[PDB]
Amino acid sequence: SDLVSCSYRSLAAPDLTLRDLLDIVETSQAHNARAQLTGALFYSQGVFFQWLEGRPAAVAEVMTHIQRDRRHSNVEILAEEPIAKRRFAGWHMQLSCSEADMRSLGLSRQIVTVGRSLVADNTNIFSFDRIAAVRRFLSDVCAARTLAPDTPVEADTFALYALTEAQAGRSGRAKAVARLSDLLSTDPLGRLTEVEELLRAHAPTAADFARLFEACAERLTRALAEDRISRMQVTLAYSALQMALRRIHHLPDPQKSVGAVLVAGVPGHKPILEAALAAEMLRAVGWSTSVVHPESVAALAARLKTSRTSTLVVAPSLLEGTEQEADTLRFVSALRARTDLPGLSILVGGRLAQLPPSKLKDSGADAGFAHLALLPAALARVA
Numbered sequence: 001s002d003l004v005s006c007s008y009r010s011l012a013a014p015d016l017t018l019r020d021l022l023d024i025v026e027t028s029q030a031h032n033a034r035a036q037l038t039g040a041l042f043y044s045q046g047v048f049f050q051w052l053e054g055r056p057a058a059v060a061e062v063m064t065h066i067q068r069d070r071r072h073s074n075v076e077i078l079a080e081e082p083i084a085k086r087r088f089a090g091w092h093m094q095l096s097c098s099e100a101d102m103r104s105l106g107l108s109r110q111i112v113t114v115g116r117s118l119v120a121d122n123t124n125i126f127s128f129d130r131i132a133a134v135r136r137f138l139s140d141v142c143a144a145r146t147l148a149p150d151t152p153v154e155a156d157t158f159a160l161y162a163l164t165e166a167q168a169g170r171s172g173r174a175k176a177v178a179r180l181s182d183l184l185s186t187d188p189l190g191r192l193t194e195v196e197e198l199l200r201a202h203a204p205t206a207a208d209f210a211r212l213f214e215a216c217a218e219r220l221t222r223a224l225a226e227d228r229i230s231r232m233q234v235t236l237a238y239s240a241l242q243m244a245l246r247r248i249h250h251l252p253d254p255q256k257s258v259g260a261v262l263v264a265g266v267p268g269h270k271p272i273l274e275a276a277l278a279a280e281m282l283r284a285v286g287w288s289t290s291v292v293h294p295e296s297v298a299a300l301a302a303r304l305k306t307s308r309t310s311t312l313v314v315a316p317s318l319l320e321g322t323e324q325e326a327d328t329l330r331f332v333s334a335l336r337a338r339t340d341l342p343g344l345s346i347l348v349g350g351r352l353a354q355l356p357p358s359k360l361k362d363s364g365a366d367a368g369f370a371h372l373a374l375l376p377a378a379l380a381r382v383a
């Protein structure tokens with residue numbers, strides 16, 4: 001064989017256009033054709049996935065150029081593996097984007113459309129599940145269209161690919177969450193290294209961390225309810241998780257950003273972990289994010305009229321939920337009263353996000369996210 005594959009994830013320049021994508025595709029088609037490289041490029045919501053395959057030398061050279069490109073950043077290698085045969089034969093470099101992005105760019109082949117519609121807001125689907133699903137889907141479309149070019153492929157076909165990948169990961173993740181919950185319930189600070197190794201193995205991205213934390217959080221909420229652990233124990237666990245999070249994920253603020261967003265806790269609530277997670281997730285998709293823990297409504301009012309950052313995410317506290325709801329209501333309402341800003345957008349999480357959007361209209365919050373990992377998606381809708 002002696003064929004190798006390399007795949008990465010990167011953050012497209014916030015000002016990326018169709019002309020750019022097309023230039024990339026043409027340059028790549030020409031060069032990959034000469035150098036005997038094949039693969040696919042997937043663009044969705046400011047993010048790139050690329051797969052490249054060929055002889056080692058060819059892949060290395062082209063990656064040397066790509067890594068230095070200025071139309072994307074935060075290039076993260078995902079795989080460098082030997083393959084037995086090409087997954088994208090005949091595709092020197094094929095472009096593909098999501099259905100939503102297809103709408104947003106005004107496109108309708110030859111660009112392979114991927115329908116994320118049915119699975120995008122499914123919190124059981126982890127980041128690597130989505131990556132693998134896109135890979136398998138595109139490789140399959142490549143085979144298919146090699147066999148029958150004029151035979152169209154249903155976009156929402158991708159849904160099944162994603163769901164299947166996630167289901168494959170499900171049991172192992174259940175084990176991880178169980179083991180984790182045990183650690184957090186016993187002595188999470190005495191065994192922080194084990195907590196970290198677990199989190200590092202099962203949560204490659206910040207959104208994955210958030211998924212695990214949501215699962216653990218309902219587990220421990222149950223435990224505390226049944227008086228199986230103490231409040232002090234939940235505090236310990238919370239500290240441990242903050243430390244583990246900072247050790248593992250700590251993205252710098254994107255220099256080229258898609259926009260700016262303020263992440264705040266409700267005064268008295270200390271959504272330290274959840275706000276940190278919110279910031280990591282939003283930074284990972286290209287948002288400039290600031291975390292604020294105000295102790296008054298007026299403070300945040302000041303920071304907002306000073307920042308002119310028209311978007312505010314109220315991070316929920318998923319472990320102090322005795323009175324998170326009415327507190328958040330009062331806080332957001334008050335904020336709206338002290339404010340004179342028609343462009344301001346407010347997003348809310350937690351139990352408040354579980355109410356029907358009629359209540360959301362009634363609330364003064366603009367939109368909700370019933371789960372942390374849904375935050376990026378909820379934000380994009382408002383922007």
Ligand SMILES: Cc1cc2nc3c(=O)[nH]c(=O)nc-3n(C[C@H](O)[C@H](O)[C@H](O)COP(=O)(O)O)c2cc1C
Pocket residue numbers: 024027028029031032041048050052062065066067068069070071072093
């Ligand atoms: C997301 C992305 C993917 C790219 N993929 C390839 C590729 O597969 N093959 C290629 O030759 N260039 C690719 N490029 C472009 C190169 O980084 C660079 O434009 C080119 O290789 C150097 O220009 P040159 O024609 O003067 O050598 C890609 C760029 C971006 C931003």
Ligand SMILES: [Cl-]
Pocket residue numbers: 007078079132135
């Ligand atoms: Cl891969």
Ligand SMILES: [Cl-]
Pocket residue numbers: 098099100101114115116117
């Ligand atoms: Cl979509």
Ligand SMILES: [Cl-]
Pocket residue numbers: 116119120130162
């Ligand atoms: Cl998806």
Ligand SMILES: [Cl-]
Pocket residue numbers: 009127128205
């Ligand atoms: Cl990802």
Ligand SMILES: [Cl-]
Pocket residue numbers: 126127128129202203204
């Ligand atoms: Cl994973």
Ligand SMILES: [Cl-]
Pocket residue numbers: 087135136137139
């Ligand atoms: Cl595959």
Ligand SMILES: [Cl-]
Pocket residue numbers: 175176179
């Ligand atoms: Cl485990």
Ligand SMILES: [Cl-]
Pocket residue numbers: 186187188189190191236
């Ligand atoms: Cl401890």
Ligand SMILES: [Cl-]
Pocket residue numbers: 190191192193194195
């Ligand atoms: Cl340990």
Ligand SMILES: [Cl-]
Pocket residue numbers: 310340341342343344
């Ligand atoms: Cl405004």
